[PDB]
Amino acid sequence: NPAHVLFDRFVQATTCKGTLKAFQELCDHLELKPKDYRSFYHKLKSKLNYWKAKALWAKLDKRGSHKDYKKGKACTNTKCLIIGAGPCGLRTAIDLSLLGAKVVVIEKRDAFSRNNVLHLWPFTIHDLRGLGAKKFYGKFCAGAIDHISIRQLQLILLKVALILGIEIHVNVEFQGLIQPPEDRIGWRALVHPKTHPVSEYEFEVIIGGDGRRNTLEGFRRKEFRGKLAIAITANFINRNTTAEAKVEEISGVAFINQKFFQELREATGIDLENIVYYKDDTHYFVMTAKKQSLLDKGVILHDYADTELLLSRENVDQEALLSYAREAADFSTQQQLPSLDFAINHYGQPDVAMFDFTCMYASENAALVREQNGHQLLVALVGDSLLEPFWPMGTGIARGFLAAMDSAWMVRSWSLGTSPLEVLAERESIYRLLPQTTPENVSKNFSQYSIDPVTRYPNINVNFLRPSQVRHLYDTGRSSKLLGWCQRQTDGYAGVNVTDLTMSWKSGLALCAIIHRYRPDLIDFDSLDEQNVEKNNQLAFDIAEKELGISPIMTGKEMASVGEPDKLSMVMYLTQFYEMFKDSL
Ligand SMILES: Cc1cc2nc3c(=O)[nH]c(=O)nc-3n(C[C@H](O)[C@H](O)[C@H](O)COP(=O)(O)OP(=O)(O)OC[C@H]3O[C@@H](n4cnc5c(N)ncnc54)[C@H](O)[C@@H]3O)c2cc1C
């Protein structure tokens, strides 16, 4: 069965682009429209009768049947935008999908490239298994493995997300919010490129899952400055031989082995406070190295006053850095690994990297609400943008996923009509615990974990803060859409300037430009003479009729002499181009 082959190719895809393409090919073959999100998942599992697929349906159905989701109707009418397809953005997206919301994720990259390896708490392993992780990554947490690379976690969550009808757009950089206009269009996003279909999306919830670079306004950062702290990560090719399998992991609770560090410093000049080894798709090491040792070995060329000069690509000898990392890895595993060949990163270089942990950040607040021109927008942070992890402690995914579930619960309460201040008060009451969570003070009964915070935080007081304590987090300060669409799509075209839906169309160049924007094979826009008003109009009209099936409302000569085109007719005509092409860039 060809649909089975397409499903297999989707499941087995090894890149973000390859996953998106296999999924689109599966949907086309099955004649399914993911953008009709309220029915997509049910139609897909009805149409695809494949034993492999049915195994996955049972897991997702079981997850979605929890009473917290209200059978998928708690958020049926809520539109959410997620910034970032990292693990925490995608995990949030997935729970928002199970509540019935429409969800769109925009991601500025188009590849999952990070090889570094993430520690997983037991509850997260159980969460991921329950989402079908093993059907996308057969080796997932095999035996006593409790880690996974960043990019493999991204691939699993991407696949789950696509199955549920979540929309994922790569090569889209979020730049800002666009307030609603006056007098009905809601909140929108400024994205690059602004011609992207997602510029049409109006949403009531936006989630910042874009790590440190996140620049949603209204989230003041708390700074935690400590002693100079430098971490080095490294990945080596893992050929899964028997020699390689025998080498024992180094857990990262193991450093509390200080004699080893003294021996290592005296034998090699490498002075570490901690080193971690995970045996995963790569042999992954992370270590924290003292500044003086890195100068002594030539990794850092000059000792600058403070760090961002100290750790600049100009002040760091890459070959010495590679040597230092390999040497530390080899000694820490006692030269039992046959070979230490660097895996190759995004840029085609050996995969070593250095990071500054001297200052870490966390948002004062997880959420806020914006209201303008009658439209309310729930804004919240999740993941590294909310609370930065110190990798050796293994809290990144655990607290990202707690906050993902907390955010889902917040959006559930929003959609059910809870007043904004009570939504915020509850969210902030939950958020106050996040930097105290450990595998032992968080709930133990994984089989009953749900987005309901009571299932995850024993004895939580969700009314710790009063609504009056979060007043400062509520901030009060012609199809116009069609017009805005034509403006963005025609921007940059010589001779065109769309300021209305009548006068700006008499020359014919604007519509020729709309056609060229989406079907450059049908028209040479550059060859056109702006003075040939009748010829250019009629060319646009004929192409649209013959190639696009849009019936003309007038002739070129009628347009060339009209004075002002009827606007009801202009709008009926232009809207057909809008509907044909708006989702289609
Ligand atoms: C280079 C690097 C190495 C790391 N190494 C380790 C490690 O060894 N061990 C460890 O435990 N943790 C490590 N981490 C942290 C770990 O990746 C995160 O804790 C984890 O992935 C969860 O973070 P997140 O999903 O919130 O954000 P991230 O994983 O940072 O994902 C953010 C996503 O948002 C996208 N994005 C950013 N800005 C925009 C925008 N304007 N528009 C659209 N998309 C945008 C980014 O491309 C990215 O895909 C590393 C992080 C980085 C950046």
Centre of ligand 1 to C-alpha 360, Å, is 15
Resolution (A): 2.3
CA distance linking residue 455 with residue 447, whole number of Å? 10
Relative to beta strand 79-83, strand 205-208 is parallel
The number of beta carbons lying within 10 Å of the beta carbon of residue 176 is 12
The architecture of the domain spanning 481-585 is Orthogonal Bundle (1.10)
| 1-480: CATH number | 3.50.50.60
Looking up tokens 């960043």, which residue turns up?
150
| Exp. method | X-ray
Q: Among 82, 90, 150, 401, name the best residue to mutate to test ligand 1's pocket (greatest count of ligand atoms within 8 A of Cβ).
A: 150
Amino acid at 527: S
Dihedral, CA atoms, 168, 171, 175, 177, nearest 10 degrees?
A: -30
CB 247 within 8 A of CB 279: yes
Q: How far apart are CA 64 and CA 76, in angstroms?
A: 14
For the beta carbon of residue 65, count every other beta carbon within 10 angstroms.
12
Angle between helices 509-518 and 567-581 (to 10 degrees): 10
User: Can you give the length of the chain in residues?
Assistant: 585
- Tell me how far apart the alpha carbons of residues 502 and 563 are, in angstroms, rounded to a whole number: 10
Residue 356 to residue 336: CA distance in whole angstroms:
30
Measured distance CA(193)–CA(175) in Å, rounded = 10
- List the one residue out of 426, 360, 421, 364 whose CA is nearest residue 395: 360
* Residue 545: C-alpha distances to residues 502, 538, 549, 551 (Å): 20, 10, 5, 5
Domain boundaries, the chain: 1-480, 481-585
Q: Is 208 in the pocket of ligand 1 (CB under 6 A)?
A: no
Give whole-number Cα distances, 52 to 32, 561, 566, in Å: 19, 64, 57
Cα 436 from Cα 382, distance rounded (Å): 16
Q: Are 222 and 366 in contact (CB under 8 A)?
A: no
Q: Can you name the residues that pair with 285 across neighbouring β-strands?
A: 234, 277
How far is 479 from 573, CA to CA, in rounded Å?
Answer: 12
* Among the listed residues 135, 115, 127, 191, the one whose alpha carbon sits nearest the alpha carbon of residue 10: 135
Q: Which residues contact 521 (CB under 8 A, 6 or more apart)?
A: none
Please name which of 210, 205, 215, 198 lies closest in space to residue 96, comparing C-alpha atoms: 205
> How far apart (Å, rounded) are the C-alpha atoms in residues 415 and 96?
11
Q: Using a 6 Å cutoff on CB, does residue 85 contact ligand 1?
A: yes
Three-state SS for 381? strand
Is 174 annotated as a binding-site member?
yes
Spatial distance between the Cα atoms of 373 and 385, rounded to a whole number of angstroms: 28
Question: Is the Cα dihedral 414, 420, 424, 426 positive or negative?
Answer: negative
Which two structure tokens, joined as six digits, stand for 189? Answer: 């996003």
Helix (H) or strand (E) holding 25: helix 16-29
Rounded distance between C-alpha atoms, residue 98 and residue 160, angstroms: 11
The ligand 1 atom at the shortest distance from the C-alpha of residue 215 is: 41
* Count of other CB atoms within 10 angstroms of residue 581: 18
Q: What is the dihedral of CA 508, 511, 516, 517, to 10 degrees?
A: 140
CB 154 within 8 A of CB 86: yes
Sheet of strand 167-169, all strands in order from the earlier edge strand to the far edge: 167-169, 102-106, 79-83, 205-208, 375-381, 367-372, 474-475
